[PDB]
User: Fold DCLRE1A from Homo sapiens.
Amino acid sequence: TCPFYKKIPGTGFTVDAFQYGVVEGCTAYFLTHFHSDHYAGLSKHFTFPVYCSEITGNLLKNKLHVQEQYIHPLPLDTECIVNGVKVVLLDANHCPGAVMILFYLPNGTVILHTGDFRADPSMERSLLADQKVHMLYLDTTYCSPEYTFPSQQEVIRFAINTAFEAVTLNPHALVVCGTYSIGKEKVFLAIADVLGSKVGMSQEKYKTLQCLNIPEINSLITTDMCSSLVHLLPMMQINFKGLQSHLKKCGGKYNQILAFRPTGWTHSNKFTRIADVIPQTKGNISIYGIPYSEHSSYLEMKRFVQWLKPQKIIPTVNVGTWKSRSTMEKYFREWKLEAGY
Ligand code: NI
Assistant:
């Protein structure tokens, strides 16, 4: 049944709750972003109001065929009224179109639901600075001190320098980047920009990117693989067998692959700096696992929460085991005693 951490008290609303059938008493279903564990359940047969960003609404219409009459896109950073309740959508710094949702309950309680997010100090200067938040529904994906990772900027500098050096040493090398969802577009787009190429991809993936309002996108992507030396493939195909097979398909245009897998975290982060990352190599194929995250590190999460000073935290991730729940609650208490709220 629908878990409590998906329901907004004092309203008829749910967040990211499309796989439970008709949730009894729900008048408005919000969707924070277009990732499958969150939209699971939506289709052209859904007939209740969906509230979301413009970009998420484009993806609902074009990829899932949800009918337009049930899609209610909202502008960001703007006070809107939904079924009698004031709400605001804020940028979550996750994937394109991903939002956090502020709810102003009729009784005076203010609730922030982060959806999935990568906390950032810029958020301390949004509409969040303007009133107190009582209850925080928090993306706790990486809520343990072992999870450190570099800035997105550091990771993209590493990827651009590596790709440019490889292709300038060997003009017959192909660059391949893995994907299985929206998000992390800066990885492949930055590499294509330094090489003077478009990114080549499947018709399905091209359609997805064309829903994202990214400026000048017609100038950066293409379905013509032959004209491109940066190819996007499914993440599953980013292994030696999959890559050797792809190289066969290019008809001797290329003699080497350099491949990137933008993972979240991997335990090479508890030891290794970004400067010190090395690939797995077999023959003329090299694979680089790079720690490009669209979720908060532990320290980013901790800073955001100690700034916001909520009265109550409701985790939304890692909630399925008692040891994970109890560990997170211990961190929340440490943070509150350190900061004095
Ligand atoms: Ni997500």
Remarks:
- The pocket of nickel (II) ion is lined by residues 33, 35, 94, 116 (CB under 6 Å).
- The chain has two domains: 1-147+296-341, 148-295.
- The chain is about 25% helix and 20% strand.
